[PDB]
Design a protein around this ligand. Structure first.
Ligand SMILES: [Ca+2]
Ligand SMILES: [Sr+2]
Ligand SMILES: [Sr+2]
Ligand SMILES: [Zn+2]
Ligand SMILES: [Zn+2]
Lengths: 8, 164
């Protein structure tokens, strides 16, 4: 695999 | 890796169904439902797609809140870091969107991460979009909080290349 969303 | 997806990574019917498998306790259930509905409404306005909530795992997009290893071999990482992940359109696990419940989920102005913004981004992947390199785009890979309209030209360009 999935695409992930990341916090800074 | 060796894992591969099936198909062309776009949906081939117009009424996309979604199932909310479970809930974070961080917000009222109706508030979570609405945040997801608003995220889908962002995409329905610019595509020929409609999004219909269903109530069994017989759904295109299954939505799940999970912590650490939550069933798909791609574990979440606790507080901060990875916030959510999503799979591109297709059968089975494809289409699905998972949110890390080790996060504090809020809405705009809340002390935690915006569930609306994260869902809008994750749903972009669940419709077939890749990450963008345009820093202001919704599909840029890093979370940023905005009160402004989430969609940018690059996001709309990408979605129309898939659906017209
Ligand atoms: Ca995390
Ligand atoms: Sr699915
Ligand atoms: Sr939480
Ligand atoms: Zn992403
Ligand atoms: Zn997952």
């Amino acid at each position: 695999x999935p695409l992930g969303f990341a916090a800074r | 890796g060796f894992q591969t997806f099936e198909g062309d990574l776009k949906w081939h019917h117009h009424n996309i169904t979604y199932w909310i498998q479970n809930y974070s306790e961080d917000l009222p259930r109706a508030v979570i439902d609405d945040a997801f509905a608003r995220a889908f409404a962002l995409w329905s306005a610019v595509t020929p797609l409609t999004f219909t909530r269903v109530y069994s795992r017989d759904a295109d997009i299954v939505i799940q809140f999970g912590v650490a290893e939550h069933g798909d071999g791609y574990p979440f990482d606790g507080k901060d870091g990875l916030l959510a992940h999503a799979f591109p359109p297709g059968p089975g696990i494809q289409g699905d969107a998972h949110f890390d419940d080790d996060e504090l989920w809020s809405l705009g102005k809340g002390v935690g991460y915006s569930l609306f913004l994260v869902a809008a981004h994750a749903f972009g992947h669940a419709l077939g979009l890749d990450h963008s390199s345009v820093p202001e785009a919704l599909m840029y890979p890093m979370y940023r909080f905005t009160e402004g309209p989430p969609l940018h030209k690059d996001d709309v360009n990408g979605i129309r290349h898939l659906y017209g």
